[PDB]
Design a binder for this molecule. Structure first.
Ligand SMILES: Nc1ncnc2c1ncn2[C@@H]1O[C@H](COP(=O)(O)OP(=O)(O)OP(=O)(O)O)[C@@H](O)[C@H]1O
Ligand SMILES: Nc1ncnc2c1ncn2[C@@H]1O[C@H](COP(=O)(O)OP(=O)(O)O)[C@@H](O)[C@H]1O
Ligand code: VO4
Ligand SMILES: [Mg+2]
Ligand SMILES: [Mg+2]
Lengths: 566, 565
């Protein structure tokens, strides 16, 4: 927080000077009730009364103008701070390891981001000014002590009671706020999941189940927040008791001093009026304390997220003295266990030549996609190395891996935007000619021409504006534009029809001359004129060779191949 | 308005009585300064001073006690009302037509549901006690008029100025709140979409572009927020000027009256002291006005959705005489302008027979998935009807259609929780034997009986705990467990190996329970001996028939078969 406000130094100084002079003007104008009951009521003074009233009115007007200026500056400062914190949090969230996103739900992250609004409203143009008034009431307290001692000691006892009440109510408020935030995060995650699955929910008539679950979660949220409501009512009642009893006792003691001839009759009124510049800021700060505690809890949750190491993490002094990812894939002694579920990869030893198309075939439960994820550092192997062109993949920087390796995941995702934006995701500077070239290469031009617009149409949410095969064609078109060294075509041929499948398959074997294409697919319509086919029995590679070599031996590949032909 | 007073009336009466007693006790206790400067200072009466001070302290303690009681009751009432509003809104959202979900983004719906918190903040304990004090200050005003009858005019002028200021500042706060809430909804939508697509974003290195887009959205949100904050600052400054000038004028006029002898010097002090029960509640309400405006705009944004017609309402009527959906499926001449874009379907005539198994095939631009969604009335046909067993689909109860038709969507969605729950999305009163039977039928028992905790593993959101093929097998098992009549296998074997594919095909072929099976597949190898094949291209049934008939005809199906082989 300190670093965010470091550049803005003149604003803070102007705020402090404006607040100081505002407090001085308020203290000066608080003497109106003393001047009224000492030299303007006992004697029949009229012109002096009018002059004094006008002077105090113009002093108050100057005071309120200064308050307006200070409030504007405070609002500007707070909004800048909120911008900095929110942008920093989001920029850090977009750089977390992929194992974080597979455990936590989307709703938790969305709720923890949007909880920064509570931080925004707790440092707004009111709470910060109230804190400034609280810290500046020291001058008023000093002057109030100078006026009289016993009533000042009574006010000091009131301040001590305030402090004790605040200290006692420090932990329960935080606990209640954190519980409410956690329950609200659960509710948000459940609602996001339900809205994303609404199609299945309506298809299967699951309205009642989701309604009951959300009702239970809402009940939990309301229970926690009602506990917080009682916890705040207790503090409010205690603070009101202390404030009112202090006021009554200070009035009684002032009257006692008046009777004994310690102060004049009007100085008690001056003390009472000036008490609004010593006790009222503290009472307002105490009344706003729950808001500050909520802001503290939200900031602590944001810091809990920010504590996680970034996606870089174990980069191990990368070896950027390289030009491209051209070479041999050297999966050797590779094991991966998904972090305490069960082993999936059991010592896989495979080799891919320096530029060729290879295909990985296996059962549904085999870790075929796991190899693709491991090959681009989404995860890290439990044992062994990868050795992209004789050098370990760890020594290569993550940016180069993500830039020179093209991936087509099984779950094709298209963001909401123009087809120009979708076909150019990480590029941001590719001209149009390459766009048409890639679209025609992946057979994604014919449909995109027959649209209300051309390369400018809007796509709703996760590409709901198109069909599944259409989304697959767009996604496979996008990956071609990276001009990659390794193209991991991961089941990018599932939803495509026969004519489109044949066209795109004929197009794939024409990609330049220097690219390693790993076709993770089990269509078996393709994978017939390939250099090597890798078959894995859900734990490791068992059969290697080309199509003719695999069909020559009557093994698992023969068993899979015989039923596909008929 | 709301319709909430019907169940909660005793609590309302208790709050009302507590408010009257609190106001009366405060008015009575305000006279302390008058009794101090009129009867206890001119005539030294320390013995009576202590008694009066103790009595007023007791009065204040009682006043705080009833304030605590009223605050408790108001907090409970607000909690109940917020629960009612939240549940009503969610229950209405869950049963909206699919056009609403197709058009509107997820984040917008999430944000305008979360706005229920902003609706809550204005029905809290303090925000309602301030309003009840404002409405109860009539007694204080009456006593003010009785006491002085001349200084009350200045208070009336102050309240008139407050009303003028609020009437001026009503609309711009409303507009700024609308703008900031809409911008925040857009930012939330972008955030949700980016977090969901983080996989592709990381794969393609598009972190910088998404960061810049989110930065721009945050910046426009903050621009609206700063405009609203400047408006709030202006309103607060004018209110403070009015309050302070009014107080100074009260003091000046009281001093003038005291000099003229029309009223005592302690009566002025009492007037200024008890003005806090007629002018301070008004100022507190005027300061809280932004929260009321935020609640109003949030409630209006909820109402925007709430006025939409639910899916069950669009239906004209229903017929009780239908109990089973088994029979023929007759797609009469039907055309479907899919949301004004293009005619994906036009002049379609299908005559699917009684309970059998048929396939619909074509290029990946046809209306196969659209036809399947029309069969479940996910969309309303523009012109035509889908006759089922001599009954039009429009005149059938929606829940019967949903329950008797199983759909294996291409976007296989697996909800977080127990796998048993993931196989029991629909009916709940299902024994565990049926679940394992369905899993065995869909070739899912073998891989599911290797998990660390059998049918109890907690799968993550969207079924990321398993593979896409395993998710499809789970969906097939769940659809089979539903025990349907018009089971639609929409490419249920997209990425299943030929082993599991053959097993599922054998299970489907051997089902034989008078179930009309529609298999929308791109793999012809699973259709070679599958009754009648409907070839659909450009929204037309160019030709149909059996596999041998289509081979003999030598149409597009023959070309696709030759290319695949
Ligand atoms: N997020 C995950 N956490 C734990 N285990 C997982 C996860 N995703 C997949 N698995 C399991 O680990 C293996 C991953 O291989 P997977 O089945 O995804 O590859 P695949 O052959 O590409 O899949 P498919 O062809 O069936 O879509 C499978 O056995 C799967 O059940
Ligand atoms: N949400 C949508 N908005 C507009 N058009 C759509 C939408 N979904 C699909 N379409 C169009 O409908 C056509 C058919 O898609 P669909 O019926 O979903 O799958 P299939 O092509 O397998 O039948 C596609 O060419 C697509 O352009
Ligand atoms: O749009 V398709 O469901 O024919 O791949
Ligand atoms: Mg896979
Ligand atoms: Mg489709």
């Amino acid at each position: 927080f300190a670093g965010f406000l470091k550049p803005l130094k003149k604003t803070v100084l102007a705020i402090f000077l404006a607040s100081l002079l505002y407090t001085a003007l308020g203290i000066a104008g608080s003497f109106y009730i003393k001047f009224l009951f000492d030299d303007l009521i006992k004697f029949e003074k009229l012109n002096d009364l009018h002059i004094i009233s006008a002077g105090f009115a113009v002093i108050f007007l100057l005071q309120i103008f200064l308050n307006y200026y200070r409030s504007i500056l405070v609002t500007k400062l707070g909004m800048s701070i909120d911008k900095s914190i929110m942008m920093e949090y989001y920029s850090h969230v977009l750089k977390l390891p992929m194992n974080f996103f597979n455990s936590r739900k989307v709703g938790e992250i969305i709720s923890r981001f949007m909880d920064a609004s509570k931080i925004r409203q707790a440092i707004s143009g009111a709470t910060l000014t109230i804190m400034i008034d609280t810290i500046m009431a020291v001058i008023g307290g000093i002057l109030l002590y100078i006026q009289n001692s016993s009533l000042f000691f009574i006010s000091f006892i009131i301040i001590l009671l305030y402090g004790i009440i605040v200290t006692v109510f420090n932990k329960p408020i935080q606990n209640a706020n954190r519980q409410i935030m956690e329950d609200n995060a659960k509710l948000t995650s459940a609602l996001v999941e339900s809205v994303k699955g609404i199609e299945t929910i309506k298809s299967f008539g699951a309205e009642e189940q989701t309604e009951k679950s959300t009702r239970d979660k809402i009940e939990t949220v309301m229970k926690s927040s009602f506990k917080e409501g009682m916890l705040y009512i207790n503090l409010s009642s205690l603070t009101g008791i202390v404030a009112g009893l202090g006021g009554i006792v200070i009035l009684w003691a002032g009257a006692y001093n008046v009777i004994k001839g310690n102060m004049s009759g009007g100085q008690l009124l001056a003390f009472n009026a000036l008490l609004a510049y010593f006790l009222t800021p503290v009472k307002n700060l105490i009344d706003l304390q729950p808001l500050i505690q909520t802001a503290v809890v939200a900031s602590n949750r944001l810091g809990e997220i920010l504590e996680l190491a970034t996606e870089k993490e174990l980069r191990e002094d990368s070896d950027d003295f390289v030009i491209s990812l051209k070479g041999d894939i050297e999966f050797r002694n590779v094991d991966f266990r998904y972090g305490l579920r069960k082993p999936v990869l059991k010592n896989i030893n495979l080799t891919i030549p320096k530029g060729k198309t290879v295909a990985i075939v296996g059962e549904s439960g085999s870790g075929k996609t796991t190899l693709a994820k491991l090959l681009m550092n989404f995860y890290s192997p439990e044992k062994g190395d990868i050795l992209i062109n004789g050098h370990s993949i760890k020594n290569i920087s993550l940016e180069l891996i993500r830039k020179k390796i093209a991936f087509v995941s099984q779950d094709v995702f298209i963001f909401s935007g123009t087809v120009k934006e979708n076909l150019a995701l990480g590029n941001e500077n590719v001209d149009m000619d390459e766009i048409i070239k890639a679209a025609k290469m992946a057979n994604a031009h014919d449909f995109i021409e027959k649209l209300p617009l051309k390369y400018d149409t809007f796509l709703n949410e996760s590409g709901a504006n198109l069909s599944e095969g259409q989304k697959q064609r767009l996604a496979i078109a996008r990956a071609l534009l990276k001009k990659p060294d390794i193209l991991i075509l991961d089941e990018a041929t599932s939803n495509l029809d026969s004519i489109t499948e044949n066209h795109i398959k004929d197009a794939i074997y024409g990609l330049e001359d220097d690219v390693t294409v790993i076709i993770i697919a089990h269509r078996l319509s393709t994978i017939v004129n390939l250099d090597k086919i890798y078959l894995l029995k859900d734990g490791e590679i068992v059969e290697s060779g080309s199509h003719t070599e695999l069909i020559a031996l009557k093994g698992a590949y023969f068993k899979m191949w015989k039923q596909t032909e008929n």
